């Protein structure tokens, strides 16, 4: 039985980046080069593996993380990057093993669409694969905020405001990050040429 990649890549709704979704892929056959030879992707960068060689490999598990960000932010979904997205929303480790895949979703995630949010305020950077869903008012000074917005007291999330009129750098992009797990355990996710 084939791994449910279509459930991730062709999902009708995608999550906001601060609340990125994770699907655990396990006990199935994965056809990576079907994805690889597709022409629908503006980004297909892999780290620690070769995209052509993926169908001959096995992993303990595969994780598929998915979310929507801005086109000029796709460069932050890579090891060693900084910025509002990598720092406070979704962080890849330095020794990342996997593939980052993205495509313009202007014709899907732009209506003025204010549904998609990102985290703007956070006192420390996320650890790799950390997910912070808190909505507590951000305390920018020494005075407690007590749950109300005001001076030095900011709501931590802000909306992308996707308008289909804008250039491609400011257009919404759906992203899928595939991470390949290799442990001293049974390998349940294998390519067809294994």
């Amino acid at each position, epitope marked *: 039985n084939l791994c449910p990649f279509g459930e991730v890549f062709n999902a009708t709704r995608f999550a906001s980046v601060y609340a990125w979704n994770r699907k655990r892929i396990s006990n199935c056959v994965a056809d990576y080069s079907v994805l690889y030879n597709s022409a629908s992707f503006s980004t297909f960068k892999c780290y620690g593996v070769s995209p052509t060689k993926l169908n001959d490999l096995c992993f303990t598990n595969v994780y598929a993380d998915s979310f929507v960000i801005r086109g*000029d*932010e796709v460069r932050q979904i890579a090891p060693g990057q*900084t*910025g*509002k997205i990598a*720092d*406070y929303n979704y962080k890849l480790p330095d020794d990342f093993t996997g593939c980052v895949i993205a495509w313009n979703s202007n014709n899907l995630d732009s209506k*003025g669409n*204010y549904n998609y949010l990102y985290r*703007l*305020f*956070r*006192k*420390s*950077n996320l650890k790799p694969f950390e997910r912070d869903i808190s909505t507590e008012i*951000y*305390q*920018a*000074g*020494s005075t407690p905020c007590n749950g109300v917005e005001g*001076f*030095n007291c*900011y709501f931590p999330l*802000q*909306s992308y*405001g996707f*308008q289909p*009129t*804008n*250039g491609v750098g*400011y257009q919404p992009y759906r992203v899928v990050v595939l991470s390949f797990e290799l442990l001293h355990a049974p390998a349940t996710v294998c390519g067809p040429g294994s």
Partner: antibody, heavy 117, light 110 residues
Framework: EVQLVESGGGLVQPGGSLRLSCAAS????????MSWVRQAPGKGLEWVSV???????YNADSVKGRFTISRDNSKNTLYLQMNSLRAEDTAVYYC???????????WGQGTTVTVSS | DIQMTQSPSSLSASVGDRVTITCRAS??????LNWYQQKPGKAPKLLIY???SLQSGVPSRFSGSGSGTDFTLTISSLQPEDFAIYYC???????????FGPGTKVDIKR
């Protein structure tokens, strides 16, 4: 109350170095997007450097490789180290807190840097 | 990057006038635009944030308007202390070294 107080401006030769400070009261530097913004004589405002709350820092291309923004949490103070200064770096330098959606609501009074031979 | 332009470069008005200043953005940046006033030799002062919200401490004669690509700042009854330069500012670009408009100077009509 709430204030930013810049110091360290002065006259320096081209190729020289200068360190500006910005002492904060009424907001936490390490918790904010803190900026240095300068204004040359008769010109408009130019962003110089920004310090993210979590630690990332960024420089405008105009000062790349020469200016370094930093901060000291114990003193609640923001700094700008300016090296390899040039005549066109002459300006009044402001420190400011950027609440990006809520605007740059707190500004210092500014400190003047003059670079000349 | 995003380039930002304001109209007009300069405006003449009298005390008690109703003044409107406009600002144009290289892209549609939704409601992410702020308005500032600057007097000669002083730091800019925040007047409007999020295109329409009045900064606390700023007199009610100041109001902001607009969305998307074009925004207008309005002074309902110009006071003597309002003669100054007015800047608009986008809060949208990456990584936070934002761009200011070129400024509209309001001087005294005679």
């Amino acid at each position: 109350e709430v204030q930013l107080v810049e110091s360290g401006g002065g006259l320096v030769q081209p190729g020289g170095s200068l360190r500006l400070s910005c002492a904060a009261s009424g907001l936490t530097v390490s918790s904010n997007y803190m900026s240095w913004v300068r204004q040359a004589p008769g010109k408009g405002l130019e962003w110089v450097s920004v310090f993210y709350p979590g630690g990332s820092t960024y420089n405008a291309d105009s000062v790349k490789g020469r200016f370094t923004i930093s901060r000291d949490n114990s003193k609640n103070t923001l700094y700008l180290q300016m090296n390899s200064l040039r005549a066109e770096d002459t300006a009044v330098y402001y420190c400011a807190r950027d609440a990006v959606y809520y605007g740059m609501d707190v500004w210092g009074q500014g400190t003047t840097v003059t670079v000349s031979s | 990057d995003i380039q930002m332009t304001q109209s007009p470069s300069s405006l003449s008005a009298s005390v008690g006038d109703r003044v409107t200043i406009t600002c144009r953005a290289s892209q549609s940046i939704s409601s992410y635009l702020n308005w500032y006033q600057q007097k000669p030799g002083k730091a800019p002062k925040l007047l409007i944030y999020a295109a329409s919200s009045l900064q606390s401490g700023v007199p009610s004669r100041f109001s902001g308007s607009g969305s998307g690509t074009d925004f207008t700042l309005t002074i309902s009854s110009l006071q003597p202390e309002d003669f100054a330069i007015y800047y608009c500012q986008e809060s949208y670009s990456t990584p936070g070294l934002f761009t200011f408009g070129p400024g509209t100077k309001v001087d005294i009509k005679r």
